[PDB]
Design a protein around this ligand. Sequence first.
Ligand SMILES: O=C(O)/C=C/c1ccc(NC(=O)C2(NC(=O)c3ccc4c(C5CCCCC5)c5n(c4c3)CC(=O)Nc3ccccc3-5)CCCC2)cc1
Ligand SMILES: O=C(O)CNC(=O)c1ccc(OCc2ccc(Cl)cc2)c(NC(=O)c2ccccc2)c1
Length: 551
Amino acid sequence: SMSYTWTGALITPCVYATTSRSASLRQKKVTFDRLQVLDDHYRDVLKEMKAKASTVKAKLLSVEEACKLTPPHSARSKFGYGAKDVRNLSSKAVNHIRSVWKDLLEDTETPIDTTIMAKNEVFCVQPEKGGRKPARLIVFPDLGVRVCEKMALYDVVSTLPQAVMGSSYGFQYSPGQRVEFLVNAWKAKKCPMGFAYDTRCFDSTVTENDIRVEESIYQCCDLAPEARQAIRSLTERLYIGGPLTNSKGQNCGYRRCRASGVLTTSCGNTLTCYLKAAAACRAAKLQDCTMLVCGDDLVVICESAGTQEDEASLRAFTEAMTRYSAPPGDPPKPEYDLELITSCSSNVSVAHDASGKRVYYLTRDPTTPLARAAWETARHTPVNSWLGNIIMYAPTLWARMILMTHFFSILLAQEQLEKALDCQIYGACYSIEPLDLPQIIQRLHGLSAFSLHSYSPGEINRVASCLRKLGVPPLRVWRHRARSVRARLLSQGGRAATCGKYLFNWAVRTKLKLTPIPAASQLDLSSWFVAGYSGGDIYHSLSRARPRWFM
Ligand SMILES: O=C(O)/C=C/c1ccc(NC(=O)C2(NC(=O)c3ccc4c(C5CCCCC5)c5n(c4c3)CC(=O)Nc3ccccc3-5)CCCC2)cc1
Ligand SMILES: O=C(O)CNC(=O)c1ccc(OCc2ccc(Cl)cc2)c(NC(=O)c2ccccc2)c1
């Protein structure tokens, strides 16, 4: 069947930001008929995945628990209430949610309406290789249905992927745990070879059968009967397909592929990618495979069979993936150094700590993070990508010297250090105070993140070249700026002084010996690095348990 069908009504609006003007270019790429052919390897991997899914017990969330997961700025319902009414448990919001729930239990077939919109994302236009990227498309159901998805499946999508895929499930790892996983897998091989597999338009390649197979895995959970019915109904009425409405309420067409804005998008994509890849590893006869899967992002680390054999085994892997309806965007390439593998737009790099010991960390090309940060300092945005980049890339030369320095000078000037800001981590929205960054960083990356040095020449050159290309002042200017920012933070005491001392320890002549922050252990990071929720409409406010009067 066609991934999409269009009436011709426009997908209307809600260095460069992607807009609805380029929607038709995206529409052409994502629209095609899928041909899928399954074999014994696919069926064998599925049964192995289902036997692991069988150990899961999932709970039904109450209306109140599902309401508390709704982001404050989540799109309002077309039925007379918004995200604020949902979070306050208003009678109208609650009544509508309960009637949506009852309808899921009673109607097993009527397709559920979804809205289609062009995503507005900021990218950097490099006129050296190609042109501007067209806008990605987001498909999501009404707020009432989104609350019902949480009741039925929040616990499933938060627990099942790790039970099924084990150590291969990428969203269970903090950045440092991800690096540790890749380094350990790489070290385990006699002669390692690794590759990234990029599927072309993954969401469009997801067939009706893929979506039913994904439900067959969910149905292996111990579930309340109403959760079992809601999952069955949601599969047939929403997850397999349905009609598309634009922002103006006009009929845009229909979808028979993965919706990008549903609670099961990340979990479904991860299970589907893992299934197809593990089966393709068997068809290609790759030896001692270790996989790392995050949605449609796949990394494979295996035992090398020789340079020519590896190229042939990769073409065999690609042929199997293509039969399973996961054709490649860029053809995969074997790599023989772990640092050369780009996965989830990141690569492993190495630095030294204050005692000269090697420390592995995750980094990336800083062009898109700096360009998005420039857009965010220019205009008020709903999500602060600079904040998520500081958190996730805290050990990097660029996040430390440029992002920390720039945003802490802005927060000092606006006197907004204590103001909680929204940022996205693995698709979920987190409300975080910048004053909590040293404790967050210590927990996610270790105390060494504040003392890294001896960065590689390749990493230093990539950062310096990026600054020149974007017209950003050189690294020496950032050191001078950080010294002043640090001095002002220290004078304020409490958490603000800790930002100065820890975040900007790199900027001082004679480096201070840093001891662990005692209040760091109090931060409740239990919802962090458990699962992926991209497009799942998930929110959490950062909480602190068992505080001490003097901390
Ligand atoms: O050789 C030497 O000894 C010294 C050289 C030297 C060169 C340039 C400066 N620039 C500045 O002082 C100003 N801009 C900046 O001090 C500046 C700060 C951050 C900048 C950023 C981002 C960096 C990441 C956080 C968000 C801000 C961008 N651009 C920046 C410029 C350059 C710019 O204007 N825009 C973009 C566009 C895309 C990407 C990045 C940028 C402020 C007043 C005059 C212009 C200072 C010193
Ligand atoms: O499931 C889906 O369908 C869509 N996929 C995702 O949602 C998705 C998959 C893997 C990801 O990253 C993994 C990673 C990267 C760097 C580091 Cl240091 C560690 C791990 C991210 N990235 C972030 O969330 C992010 C936010 C802010 C800053 C940096 C990364 C998103």
